[PDB]
Amino acid sequence: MPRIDADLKLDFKDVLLRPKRSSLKSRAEVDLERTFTFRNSKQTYSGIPIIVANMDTVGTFEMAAVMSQHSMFTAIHKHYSLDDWKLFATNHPECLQNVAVSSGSGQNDLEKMTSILEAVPQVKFICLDVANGYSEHFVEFVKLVRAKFPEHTIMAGNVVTGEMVEELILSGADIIKVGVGPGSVCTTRTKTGVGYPQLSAVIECADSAHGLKGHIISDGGCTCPGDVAKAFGAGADFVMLGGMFSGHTECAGEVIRKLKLFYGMSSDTAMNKHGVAEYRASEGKTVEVPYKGDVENTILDILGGLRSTCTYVGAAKLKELSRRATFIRVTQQHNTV
Amino acid sequence: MPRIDADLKLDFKDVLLRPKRSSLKSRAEVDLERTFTFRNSKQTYSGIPIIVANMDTVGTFEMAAVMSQHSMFTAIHKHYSLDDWKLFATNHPECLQNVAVSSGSGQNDLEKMTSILEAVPQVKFICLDVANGYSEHFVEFVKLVRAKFPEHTIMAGNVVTGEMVEELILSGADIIKVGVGPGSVCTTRTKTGVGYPQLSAVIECADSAHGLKGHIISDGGCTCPGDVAKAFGAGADFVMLGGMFSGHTECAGEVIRKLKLFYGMSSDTAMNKHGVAEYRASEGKTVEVPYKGDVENTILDILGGLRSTCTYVGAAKLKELSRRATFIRVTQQHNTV
Amino acid sequence: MPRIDADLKLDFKDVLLRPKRSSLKSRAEVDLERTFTFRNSKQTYSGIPIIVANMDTVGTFEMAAVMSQHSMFTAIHKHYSLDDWKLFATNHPECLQNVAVSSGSGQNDLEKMTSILEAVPQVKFICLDVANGYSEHFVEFVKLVRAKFPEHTIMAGNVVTGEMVEELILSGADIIKVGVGPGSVCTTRTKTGVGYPQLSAVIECADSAHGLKGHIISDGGCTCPGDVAKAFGAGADFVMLGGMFSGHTECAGEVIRKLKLFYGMSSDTAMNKHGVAEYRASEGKTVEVPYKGDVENTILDILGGLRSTCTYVGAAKLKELSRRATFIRVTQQHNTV
Amino acid sequence: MPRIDADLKLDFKDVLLRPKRSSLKSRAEVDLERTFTFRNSKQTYSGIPIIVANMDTVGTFEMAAVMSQHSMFTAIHKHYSLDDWKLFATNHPECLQNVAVSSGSGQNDLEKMTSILEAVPQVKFICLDVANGYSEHFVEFVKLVRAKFPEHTIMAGNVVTGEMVEELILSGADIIKVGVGPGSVCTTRTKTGVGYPQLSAVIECADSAHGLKGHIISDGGCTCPGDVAKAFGAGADFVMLGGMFSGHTECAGEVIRKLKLFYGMSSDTAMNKHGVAEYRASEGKTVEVPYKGDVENTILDILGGLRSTCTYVGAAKLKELSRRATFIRVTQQHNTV
Numbered sequence A, B, C, D: 001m002p003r004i005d006a007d008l009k010l011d012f013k014d015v016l017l018r019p020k021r022s023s024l025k026s027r028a029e030v031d032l033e034r035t036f037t038f039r040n041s042k043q044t045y046s047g048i049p050i051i052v053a054n055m056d057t058v059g060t061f062e063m064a065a066v067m068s069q070h071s072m073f074t075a076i077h078k079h080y081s082l083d084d085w086k087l088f089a090t091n092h093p094e095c096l097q098n099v100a101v102s103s104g105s106g107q108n109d110l111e112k113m114t115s116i117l118e119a120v121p122q123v124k125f126i127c128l129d130v131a132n133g134y135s136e137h138f139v140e141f142v143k144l145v146r147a148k149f150p151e152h153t154i155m156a157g158n159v160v161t162g163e164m165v166e167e168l169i170l171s172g173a174d175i176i177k178v179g180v181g182p183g184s185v186c187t188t189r190t191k192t193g194v195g196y197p198q199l200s201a202v203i204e205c206a207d208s209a210h211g212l213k214g215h216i217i218s219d220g221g222c223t224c225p226g227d228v229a230k231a232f233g234a235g236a237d238f239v240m241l242g243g244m245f246s247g248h249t250e251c252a253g254e255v256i257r258k259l260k261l262f263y264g265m266s267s268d269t270a271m272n273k274h275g276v277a278e279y280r281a282s283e284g285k286t287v288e289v290p291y292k293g294d295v296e297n298t299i300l301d302i303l304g305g306l307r308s309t310c311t312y313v314g315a316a317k318l319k320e321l322s323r324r325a326t327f328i329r330v331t332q333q334h335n336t337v
């Protein structure tokens, strides 16, 4: 029996947030910092919950040192060496509280990560990523990492439904990475037919996490600050971004109209440059992106957009955005000429 | 609890007006003038209820002097000086009954407006505009302007839902400006995720105004005369337009294929040229538009379109259009080659 | 009260015809000729019910002489003179049974038509066209033409709903022309907001005609032979076409890549060349179309397509197509690369 | 009575497959081979159920010799001669178990096929194709072929609904070819208005076959490996492909940016090169396609995609994919820049 779910699954383009009444005079009143206490690691975090994705070109140390100035976060890419990290530590000690070390489920990866966590005790976040986030093999791996590092906060993914968000949390992960399909350079939908609309995946997964006192990252699929806001509005605790951060000076890669090469974690460009075949669910794209320059401007644009959103729905802090969010269903997002 | 309204919100593209039986021989029979009596100012107005928007390039004095010849209206941009206005008065006294002076919620703006209303008693309309039309701060500001000018008619905005249309009317505004998102150079949807489909916003807001014996302007989102007609058909008492009036000789700005620069009230181009950051809900676009020449032709095209609409639905006067309007839901608006 | 009909109105793109079981070996078995007896004129017609539209460039005498060889029909454009027609009669007497003379509702038009019907008794069809097919003025005009020519068959239009199809038939018209909006060079939707999806307009109007033993033409909106088939399948008794016949050698106008100018009946190009302002509901477009050459090939393509349709649904004659038509609702019509 | 089925018929773009929990470590665990026993021929087949379509350019002997190395299948085009086939047999004896000989319903075709089956007893599949797969003439032809070759497995088509799938199976065909409209170079929808969405046609037809212990091919409409997976997920026993195999070295036709000419079975290019008028339901297109080079890479890409799909839904073998398939309804398939 092949069956078809009756419920149309919407994405970001299919909706808008409705404005509401409030006493908020203007957007600089709004506080975008959140304070979280994690279910399993028992650690506490405070910052602006926007994470740079652990992709080759954007999850760099340079990107980190800027984000951190804004209390934002960076999931560092897994190809840096131990020596690379010990220089990062020496150079930017104040940044270590705002980064996560990354690993796949392979033994070599686990060992290298371990050497990093031991050499840099200030790093207190771990980001774990596989091709099939629904595998029992990932479940037992998450148990292993939890046992090895009982006081480190664990981000794990990726999934799109709530049964697997609960199983991953109950198996020791703190923050589940929700998203398969929508990523700017993800090709699961084309290559495999498998995936989920981003908005629907957050609505559905956020509820499942929060009943366990766990948390989620909306990973992928945001194309402008409005999407970030919708992602938060849908219940996401953090939002992670690759494509919106691609193209800047603090991105790794030469400038080539000035452009830069933006490529997926499991892309052909990636496999050539490195053992990444089964790191993500699809062999992602390799695109050319216009050179945007310094990431500060982009950060300002994004945070500013999000402050307005909160103001316009009556949220004085980011914590209250999902509480105040009413989405309306629309037939369009743009007025063309 | 993030929730999603079950009702799909349609816009202008999603519908058509149905023709109906009548005794109307032709479109020159139709009278497009309306006579209004305002709830709070208690003043009476007669004209063709189509308003040029208070944008830098289109809300000019030159635009005004043409519109006025057609009994149309112009919301003048807020950057003109007192001296500029006193020349407008001297030069085009017969036009003063067909313009509104504009202001934001800042004290400097209020003072400059006040000096203008005192120096030109013939100006009897006020247009008030903010970034967050749902703020309690806007509500109290509207009370202040009402108290300062008890015999001036007040347009205030912008909103998209009826609870705020009622609160603004009950707080002293006469005519509520309805529209957030659809404007040709508005970027709220992209930058903030917040907005509303224009047609749905008028249907919903018109009902709310009219129960209080108040009035609304459909502000933004019309791309052709058909949209104007639909806007009126949905219940709007006036319709305001920026983009359809952009590009003409009576527009402010040099001619540059001949083009002209059309930019938003809170756009980057605006901030550079002037203190406009929080005048509108978004930092609007700056587009190039083809030089259309004299606004008379455009006016003729638009009024002509609207006369046909009334004829085809059986409305001998514009007053009867919403009464006679049945919208049908469609899957398209164009026959491509 | 502005209201919105709950029923989504589909067009040709939104549907497909379902194949069905039959004993039909192949498409040359299918007979596309119909025999009609008209309600009010009491005349009988036999032919392939596909009519060339009465547009300047396609409703020519040259087009007629080809169509007629295929038992197809031509609604001749209203600008030809009496002398022009008397040469047509002399030259192509066998074609006169397959054409209609055209007129608007003006007295000059009526007189010129009258002179034509008197000078050419073999012409037994009249085509009457106005801007507002819902006007009481059109209703009384139809009564007048019926009384003046009691044995001529009258095509009248255009409408999209059944209440007006019945009133026009009961007022003496034989064949109602159904379609407002979808025409290739019609601009009602853009200029006035008024119109109707073609498929929905035929479904709805065909039922209304046939209960009175009257007939309809699906006028406008077909872009390929599939649309013709759907139009017939929806219940239409005839289908009229402009754009699909545009571009051929037998079209009026010079060749200019080789192109030809195709323009609407009430278009600016039309008004310049001639008193046509209120002949159709909109001031239609003027497009450039590629030179297709001889209309024979196009005719062959269209008739062939329609024979296959009948075969694939089990209709041995065109009469049985609507009887055998089941439409399925689809989300697309094309497989792009 | 023209009527409209209430059920919207979805295609591949309208859905995604949902990931599910499993114990599958990775995609090389998945077995894509199936073992089938046919209802009427009583023969058994084992291989990867992906068939190259019997089109001029892709159903070649060269294509066959590669496919066969991958346990894939090739429906050979019907224009090869007896002598051509006897060389194929001599050269690639091990491939004969993985090809089908093709024929239309004409006597010449039947005779030539017969001479081939007699000269090459190793060929045990027959592929039969007509313009109207719903004709009683096709039904009796299928009876004739069954009687002539009682131990050959018969693929017959094409249809889209289950009443005709059952009648063709009960009349002796083994494997019904399901698909009319979606094919990359099919024009039925444009030329005739007749067709069916591919996904809906498989869902509906698969059920009908399987109740008779028969089988179906999803013929046409796949544009990437995701579509293949969805096709299998919907219940299809095999999937046939033309366009995805077009463009390779083992395709027939010269290289011309390097391109190759890809044309339909009943296309104008086909009729010119050969008696094919009524072989398929439409006169298909002739497109230019980029030269992809060797078909091995494409095969690897497609099989790899399909292994991931099975892994991500928890299917260790292709047999279990439809059993494990839950489709979700979506509003999009792509993230544009």
Ligand SMILES: Nc1nc2c(ncn2[C@@H]2O[C@H](COP(=O)(O)O)[C@@H](O)[C@H]2O)c(=O)[nH]1
Binding pocket: A053, A054, A055, A158, A179, A182, A183, A184, A185, A186, A187, A188, A219, A220, A221, A222, A240, A241, A242, A243, A244, A263, A264, A265, A266, A267, A280, A281, A282, A283, A284, A285
């Ligand atoms: N399946 C797949 N996902 C990728 C690949 N590269 C990056 N991603 C995903 O894309 C996400 C970011 O999405 P974006 O913000 O660019 O839309 C990353 O966090 C990661 O989840 C890849 O090669 N394959």
Ligand SMILES: Nc1nc2c(ncn2[C@@H]2O[C@H](COP(=O)(O)O)[C@@H](O)[C@H]2O)c(=O)[nH]1
Binding pocket: B053, B054, B055, B158, B179, B182, B183, B184, B185, B186, B187, B188, B219, B220, B221, B222, B240, B241, B242, B243, B244, B263, B264, B265, B266, B267, B280, B281, B282, B283, B284, B285
């Ligand atoms: N949010 C926003 N709205 C603008 C800006 N500039 C103009 N608008 C809106 O656009 C309206 C006109 O819309 P239009 O007729 O061009 O679609 C104006 O009345 C105003 O409400 C801007 O910079 N930001």
Ligand SMILES: Nc1nc2c(ncn2[C@@H]2O[C@H](COP(=O)(O)O)[C@@H](O)[C@H]2O)c(=O)[nH]1
Binding pocket: C053, C054, C055, C158, C179, C182, C183, C184, C185, C186, C187, C188, C219, C220, C221, C222, C240, C241, C242, C243, C244, C263, C264, C265, C266, C267, C280, C281, C282, C283, C284, C285
């Ligand atoms: N409203 C309007 N309709 C036109 C005009 N010119 C042609 N048409 C319509 O277009 C029809 C043919 O549509 P087509 O087959 O090109 O889609 C004609 O029969 C007529 O009803 C025009 O200028 N204005």
Ligand SMILES: Nc1nc2c(ncn2[C@@H]2O[C@H](COP(=O)(O)O)[C@@H](O)[C@H]2O)c(=O)[nH]1
Binding pocket: D053, D054, D055, D158, D179, D182, D183, D184, D185, D186, D187, D188, D219, D220, D221, D222, D240, D241, D242, D243, D244, D263, D264, D265, D266, D267, D280, D281, D282, D283, D284, D285
């Ligand atoms: N109606 C029609 N179908 C064709 C023609 N040529 C190929 N096809 C269909 O297209 C199918 C392959 O579809 P594709 O994989 O290219 O989308 C073939 O198996 C066949 O069923 C043609 O000329 N007319």
Ligand code: NA
Binding pocket: A105, A106, A107, A141
């Ligand atoms: Na491991």
Ligand code: NA
Binding pocket: A057, A058, A245, A246, A247, A248, A251, A252, A253, A260, A261, A262, A289
């Ligand atoms: Na980059």
Ligand code: NA
Binding pocket: B105, B106, B107, B141
């Ligand atoms: Na103030």
Ligand code: NA
Binding pocket: B057, B058, B245, B246, B247, B248, B251, B252, B253, B260, B261, B262, B289
């Ligand atoms: Na302008």
Ligand code: NA
Binding pocket: C105, C106, C107, C141
């Ligand atoms: Na008259």
Ligand code: NA
Binding pocket: C057, C058, C245, C246, C247, C248, C251, C252, C253, C260, C261, C262, C289
């Ligand atoms: Na023409």
Ligand code: NA
Binding pocket: D105, D106, D107, D141
């Ligand atoms: Na035969």
Ligand code: NA
Binding pocket: D057, D058, D245, D246, D247, D248, D251, D252, D253, D260, D261, D262, D289
């Ligand atoms: Na090819």
